[PDB]
Design a binder for this molecule. Structure first.
Ligand SMILES: CC(=O)OCC[N+](C)(C)C
Length: 382
């Protein structure tokens, strides 16, 4: 039925949205010409998400996951046409803030719609795997090509083309869902106080710190230590798409085979992330570094695919069977690392070094990994 047509289009919206969050970080430092001046500009997407999601979470579970998606895809189009006609600084800051304002709606609505259109267990974790595989591509493989096109054509035409594509996607979604025709949700305070939800939300931030504390402070370290040209410094995350999709598929197949092993999968993913981030400050060549990044990226996929359906399963077993207000917690959790990283990571590296920050990150992840054992009793609460 329609069901598949909605899943594909929502996934494409998550791919284009995740491309504009990373294709602009190399371009911005060109038009600017205070190390804490750029940092706040780069850390404005997550700051706004931390003040809008609490006031937008309960709004999602009241208008049925369609009006918020359209609003988000309109705000994203408005934000994109701007970078295109954007120069100076204030305009860029406003565009970056509008990006977060638009992301506080679209991603949450899309994930909620994917989780709600699929109520059964063997298919929910299969749809939420395709959603994550579509999110990864476009954030891990696309920014290099965006930069290559920037160094050839500029900024005006590509951004207008991307805005046109986003508007086309929003329009055909409006034509397919047909929103132009015609239960009480749990308050976010009650959801946040549930111990299992808090445990899951803590993991969603611990497993993501060693991807926002490394992105802004890897190129300089690579250039200083290893003799690397622009090509390796630019295409350093590209050979990591394959481990991500492989891990997503493996987690989906294992969840289908044995239920109630999501906690084990999450703990294994946390251990892998910690081991990779601890191994990273040892590579003195391109290939070992690429392998370490492969391990780090394969660690994230397991945790994400294992613990994303768990929130919906818990909010279905207990509380009220309405989503939208339970993924705002996940978005808030992400927007803590993505707001605290790009501002203080450089100062931490400059005051301590690159060989201690990674050690601390790995120790934190490996120490939080045992905490996920408290979910071993889930599956009998049904
Ligand atoms: C590696 C990767 O998937 O990056 C996506 C960012 N994230 C985890 C917030 C969706």
């Amino acid at each position: 039925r329609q069901r598949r047509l909605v899943l594909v289009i929502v996934c494409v919206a998550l791919l284009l949205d995740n491309m504009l969050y990373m294709v602009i970080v190399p371009i911005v430092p060109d038009y600017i010409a205070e190390d804490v001046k750029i940092g706040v500009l780069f850390a404005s997407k997550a700051i706004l998400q931390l003040l809008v999601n609490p006031l937008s979470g309960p709004f999602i579970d009241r208008m049925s996951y369609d009006v918020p998606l359209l609003i988000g895809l309109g705000v994203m189009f408005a934000s994109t046409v701007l970078f295109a006609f954007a120069e100076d600084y204030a305009t860029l800051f406003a565009a970056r803030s509008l990006q977060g304002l638009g992301s506080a709606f679209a991603d949450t609505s899309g994930i909620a719609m994917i989780a709600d259109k699929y109520p059964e267990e063997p298919e929910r974790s299969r749809a939420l795997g395709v959603a994550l595989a579509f999110i990864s591509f476009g954030s891990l493989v696309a920014p290099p090509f965006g930069g290559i096109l920037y160094e050839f054509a500029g900024k005006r035409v590509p951004f207008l083309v991307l805005a046109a594509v986003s508007l086309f996607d929003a329009l055909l979604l409006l034509a397919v869902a047909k929103p132009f025709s015609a239960p009480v949700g749990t308050p976010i305070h009650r959801l946040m106080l549930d111990p299992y939800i808090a445990v899951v939300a803590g993991a969603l931030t611990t497993c993501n710190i060693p991807l926002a504390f490394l992105e802004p402070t890897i190129a300089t370290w690579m250039k200083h230590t290893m003799a690397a040209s622009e090509w390796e410094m630019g295409m350093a995350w590209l050979p990591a798409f394959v481990p991500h999709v492989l891990g997503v598929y493996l987690t989906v197949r294992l969840a289908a085979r044995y239920p109630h092993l999501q906690w084990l999968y999450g703990a294994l993913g946390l251990a892998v992330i910690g081991a990779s981030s601890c191994i990273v400050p040892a590579c003195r060549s391109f290939a070992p570094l690429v392998v370490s990044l492969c391990g780090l990226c394969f660690g994230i996929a397991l945790v994400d695919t294992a613990l994303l359906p768990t929130l919906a399963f818990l909010v279905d077993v207990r509380h009220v069977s309405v989503y939208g207000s339970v993924y705002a917690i996940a978005d808030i959790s992400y927007s803590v690392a993505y707001a605290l990283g790009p501002i203080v990571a450089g100062h931490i590296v400059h005051s301590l070094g690159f060989e201690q920050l990674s050690l601390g990150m790995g120790l934190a992840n490996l120490l939080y990994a045992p905490v996920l054992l408290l979910l071993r009793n889930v599956g009998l609460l049904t």
